[PDB]
């Protein structure tokens, strides 16, 4: 039972500029630590229960350090508390594949699968069940480099959920029926994640409401084989969706498998046509 010696950095409101709203509330901004001669591009995410939730997220986000996990730079305390994170200029991967589907190649797809598996296997190393793994919750720093994010529902070690709203279609069968959550439950969601990428952002079980999903998978139904997918790739998705959680693959095995395929991508995915001076990115700002 190791002591968590992560540092929580409290940043002065004066140290950062908010340029613009990226979505709804996240802002693009610049962080200039006092007299340190750097500008860090940042994303700022700006009720008592609401602060309880947001600080629990900062707790988790500050205890992780991995190149495919979203990095917390600090918090600012305000009327409204702010999380300050590394800016991901290309947004979330779901929107990204949806917008650039006609120019995404097999090697980017397979390398995103490797990188996400690395993030997840790192979160498993630190005994953390994500519980909301999905393409909308993977962000894009560059087309070559993605990071897992948005774990307000992440918990730390099975686990028993209480009352939260849930994704259901990204969820393992045991989670839906028994509110049980494990690293292997995450692997299920990883499989749905890979499926949304391989379909370029299709909605899982589109036009079905969550009420029926439980019996659908009880019956033995799963998500379809995406057109670009050889059986090799699709079989790995199907393994993430076994009813026996221990029969599903381990994130370290998923890394290996997708790495193998990333060395020869066109064998595994068939796609038509595959063929402001002192700025520092946060991945280079350490102290
Ligand atoms: C799937 C929707 C999407 O693209 N999002 C969701 C949140 C709105 C901001 C969007 N966005 C960012 N986000 C970030 O840079 C970011 C970094 C760290 C954490 C978070 C978090 F947890 F709050 F979501 C977000 N960056 C850009 C750049 C361009 C366009 C957009 C829409 C964008 C991401």
């Amino acid at each position: 039972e190791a002591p968590n010696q992560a540092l929580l950095r409290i940043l002065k409101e004066t140290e950062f500029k908010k340029i613009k709203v990226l979505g709804s509330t996240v802002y693009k901004g610049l962080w200039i630590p006092e007299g340190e001669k750097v500008k860090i591009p940042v994303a700022i995410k700006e009720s008592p229960k609401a602060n309880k939730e947001i600080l629990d997220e900062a707790y988790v986000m500050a205890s992780v350090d991995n190149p495919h996990v979203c990095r917390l730079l600090g918090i600012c305390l305000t009327s409204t508390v702010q999380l300050i994170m590394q800016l991901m200029p290309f947004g979330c991967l779901l929107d990204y594949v949806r917008e650039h589907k006609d120019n995404i190649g097999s090697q980017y797809l397979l390398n995103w699968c490797v990188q996400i598996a690395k993030g997840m296997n790192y979160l498993e190393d630190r005994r953390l069940v994500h519980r909301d793994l999905a393409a909308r919750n993977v962000l894009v720093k560059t087309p070559q480099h993605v990071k897992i994010t948005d774990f307000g529902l992440a918990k730390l070690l099975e686990y028993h959920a209480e009352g939260g709203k849930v994704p259901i279609k990204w969820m393992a069968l045991e989670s839906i029926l028994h509110r049980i959550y494990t690293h292997q439950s995450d692997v299920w969601s990883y499989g749905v994640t890979v499926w949304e990428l391989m379909t370029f952002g299709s909605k899982p079980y589109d036009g079905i409401p969550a009420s029926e999903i439980s019996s659908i998978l009880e019956k033995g139904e799963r998500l379809p084989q995406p057109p670009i997918c050889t059986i090799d790739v699709y079989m790995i998705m199907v393994k993430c969706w076994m009813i026996d959680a221990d029969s599903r693959p381990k994130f370290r095995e998923l890394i290996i498998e997708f790495s193998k395929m990333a060395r020869d991508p066109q064998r595994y995915l068939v796609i038509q046509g595959d063929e402001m001076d002192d700025v520092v990115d946060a991945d280079e700002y350490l102290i």
Side-chain angles (χ1 to χ4, degrees):
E1 284 295 12
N4 176 189
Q5 298 183 94
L7 296 175
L8 188 62
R9 206 162 163 186
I10 310 279
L11 321 171
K12 268 171 276 208
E13 197 189 37
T14 88
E15 296 186 315
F16 42 97
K17 308 322 148 171
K18 309 195 216 173
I19 314 183
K20 50 160 316 197
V21 154
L22 308 163
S24 186
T25 316
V26 184
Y27 311 70
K28 142 181 208 152
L30 285 164
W31 178 40
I32 316 189
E34 269 211 282
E36 295 316 76
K37 278 250 174 109
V38 294
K39 332 197 199 52
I40 322 291
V42 298
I44 302 146
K45 193 150 105 211
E46 170 177 44
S47 174
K49 151 160 287 181
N51 310 255
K52 191 273 187 192
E53 316 279 43
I54 187 61
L55 285 172
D56 286 8
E57 196 170 342
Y59 176 86
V60 157
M61 253 190 272
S63 318
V64 290
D65 186 10
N66 185 270
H68 303 107
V69 174
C70 186
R71 46 170 312 114
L72 183 53
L73 282 141
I75 53 164
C76 181
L77 306 157
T78 36
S79 324
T80 188
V81 54
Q82 289 152 314
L83 319 192
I84 300 111
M85 292 139 305
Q86 177 190 32
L87 176 67
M88 310 305 272
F90 294 83
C92 68
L93 185 50
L94 178 64
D95 291 12
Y96 184 93
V97 303
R98 277 176 180 171
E99 172 106 334
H100 307 84
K101 60 189 60 209
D102 292 324
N103 233 50
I104 290 162
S106 62
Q107 215 195 176
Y108 282 168
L109 288 170
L110 292 178
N111 271 131
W112 294 334
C113 293
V114 171
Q115 293 180 27
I116 296 164
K118 282 179 176 182
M120 293 309 296
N121 172 84
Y122 166 86
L123 301 175
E124 184 179 351
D125 272 336
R126 291 229 45 247
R127 329 206 58 212
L128 191 146
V129 177
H130 183 291
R131 302 176 63 221
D132 200 14
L133 176 59
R136 80 186 98 84
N137 292 332
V138 162
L139 314 176
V140 184
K141 176 193 181 187
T142 74
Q144 304 96 51
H145 188 172
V146 298
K147 295 179 171 197
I148 298 160
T149 191
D150 184 354
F151 31 65
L153 83 183
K155 300 301 186 256
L156 294 320
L157 323 181
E158 297 176 346
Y159 154 86
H160 308 49
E162 296 161 14
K165 211 70 197 181
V166 281
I168 190 96
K169 317 178 168 278
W170 285 260
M171 287 175 56
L173 175 76
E174 57 288 19
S175 317
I176 309 195
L177 303 171
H178 308 334
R179 298 147 170 170
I180 294 183
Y181 293 84
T182 167
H183 297 296
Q184 293 312 110
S185 177
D186 273 347
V187 167
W188 189 292
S189 317
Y190 176 91
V192 180
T193 300
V194 171
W195 185 96
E196 324 174 58
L197 309 180
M198 302 304 158
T199 64
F200 299 100
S202 300
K203 302 175 190 185
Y205 324 90
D206 197 12
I208 292 190
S211 1
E212 317 117 335
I213 269 66
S214 155
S215 39
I216 290 293
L217 317 162
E218 233 153 50
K219 323 212 151 303
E221 186 171 333
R222 288 319 156 85
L223 286 151
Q225 185 170 354
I228 68 170
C229 277
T230 60
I231 181 175
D232 301 74
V233 180
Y234 186 58
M235 184 151 313
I236 288 170
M237 290 146 104
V238 175
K239 289 175 167 152
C240 298
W241 302 331
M242 318 257 243
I243 280 148
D244 183 31
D246 279 335
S247 290
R248 323 166 167 159
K250 286 261 303 162
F251 282 128
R252 63 170 290 282
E253 300 171 331
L254 300 176
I255 300 170
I256 307 197
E257 269 316 284
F258 278 103
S259 289
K260 283 175 172 175
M261 321 215 294
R263 286 187 301 103
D264 184 12
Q266 321 204 326
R267 186 174 163 179
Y268 300 103
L269 297 165
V270 184
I271 298 178
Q272 209 141 41
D274 188 344
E275 150 206 359
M276 316 180 262
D277 228 9
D278 289 1
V279 170
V280 192
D281 287 327
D283 292 330
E284 280 68 52
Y285 187 82
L286 329 176
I287 166 177

